[PDB]
Paper text:
In [name], the Xcp T2SS plays an important role in bacterial virulence by its capacity to deliver a large panel of toxins and degradative enzymes into the surrounding environment. Secretins are large homooligomeric assemblies of 12 to 16 monomers forming a distinctive bipartite ring-shaped and cylindrical structure on their C- and N-terminal sides, respectively. The periplasmic N domain of secretins is constituted by the succession of structurally independent subdomains labeled N0 to N3 (7–9).
The overall structure of the XpQN012 monomer, refined at 3.0-Å resolution, showed a typical organization into three subdomains, N0, N1, and N2, where each subdomain abuts the next in an N0:N1:N2 arrangement in three dimensions. The dimer packing is stabilized by the interaction between N0-N0* and N2-N2* subdomains from each monomer (the “*” corresponds to the second molecule in the dimer). The dimerization seems to be driven by the N2-N2* contact with a buried surface of 600 Å2 that represents about 60% of the total buried surface. Most of the contacts between N2 subdomains are localized within the β9 strand interacting with the β9* in the facing N2* subdomain, creating a continuous 6-stranded antiparallel β-sheet. In contrast to [name], the N2 subdomain of GspD is not in contact with the N1 subdomain. This difference results in a high root mean square deviation (RMSD) (4.36 Å) when the two structures are superimposed. However, a slight difference was observed between the packing of the two [name] dimers, due to a general displacement of monomer B toward monomer A. This leads, in the present study, to a more compact dimer with a larger buried surface area of 1,040 Å2 compared to 880 Å2 for the previous structure.
Author numbering:
A (entry chain B): 48 to 128, 142 to 273
B (entry chain A): 48 to 127, 142 to 273
């Protein structure tokens, strides 16, 4: 009996190099189609089981526009008819499920986000600059006990403005009992996510609903 | 110039029959691998554009375990059981508003995704659960506001906590919180609070006090 857990750290390396690492990990030989090309950035500081490794492999394949098909009782890598980095961030002081609704709004159309519940981590696809930002958001989000939130679907306003309005109101103390509460803007769906301790969070909801006129 | 919108109604028909309907719609010839077999149930009461049709095709392919590849300079269907696929159009609010509210009633064996262009959603589940979810959406759509609050129960049990709140509202024991609703997500052990602002805020206070 022997069970291993892997940490992957590949930056700007070839796609065929990552597939090579994966096959050496999983023990599965893949047939790489000649048109398979590209440079991938894959980092996982969290130690992954065999399944969690495979999960991360398919994620990287989908992110870079390829798919795994079963031809002649072996896996074949063919394309599914910009450079995106991939990071596996482990949540330590709460279950991942709690964070997904909160970081999902900072993820674009080109980017992807999915949980690895077994590892209590999440896989993210985005640009190098946005990934360092989202990683920083997670890092700050993990500390808290409560991850209870409120959603405001704006109609009379514009989310980017409405949030800039609220953050200015909190900083100057013009927002009554709002010290310690956060605002997340989802431009895609035009909605606000309200966070922080119960008393504070409730006051921000009243404040933001009054701003929709 | 000429543009079309299709409505598909295929129940218990062969996979190769649906692929045939799709190719006749899209105008793209697909090469089916011999191992591709199965009976599919696909219904869309909402009229779909070419793109929205293709979206629905790939969804059905993923749901039944196949994938589309550009192999040999043509599109090929290769592999990546009582499932149905329905396209439900939301009439009053944008789909984005109702996805967080119905998503908890969707299992692992299923899948839910929005067609924002058609303001509809594609769901894969069993025939019995799909009829249930379809009438949940049909009831949820009527309202104006779909703003909501989430309570992550860290002590109690969601099924109980919700039954507790619904009883408190019916008898009027829940103060200034009329016309509000509670959604239970057992998987994540959390409560979703809905309804008019004033009412919804009172229920949040009521449900947070119940977590001890």
């Amino acid at each position: 009996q022997q069970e291993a857990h892997w940490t992957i750290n590949l930056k700007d390396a070839d796609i065929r190099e990552f597939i090579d690492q994966i096959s050496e990990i999983t023990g599965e030989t893949f047939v790489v189609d000649p048109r398979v090309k590209g440079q991938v950035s894959v980092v996982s500081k969290a130690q992954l089981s065999l399944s969690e490794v495979y999960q991360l492999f398919l994620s990287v394949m989908s992110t870079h526009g390829f798919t795994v098909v079963a031809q002649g009782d072996q896996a074949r890598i063919v394309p599914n008819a910009d450079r995106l980095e991939t990071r596996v961030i482990q949540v330590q002081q709460s279950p991942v499920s709690e964070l997904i609704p909160l970081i999902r709004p900072l993820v674009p159309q080109y980017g992807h986000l999915a949980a690895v519940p077994s590892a209590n981590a999440l896989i993210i696809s985005d640009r190098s600059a946005n990934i360092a930002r989202i990683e920083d958001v997670i890092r700050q989000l993990d500390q808290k006990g409560s991850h209870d939130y409120s959603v405001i679907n704006l109609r009379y306003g514009w989310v980017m403005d409405a949030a800039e309005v609220l953050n200015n109101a909190m900083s100057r103390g013009q927002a009554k009992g709002a010290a310690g509460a956060q605002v997340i803007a989802d431009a895609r769906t035009n909605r606000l996510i309200i966070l922080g301790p119960p008393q504070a969070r409730a006051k921000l909801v009243q404040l933001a609903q009054s701003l929709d006129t």
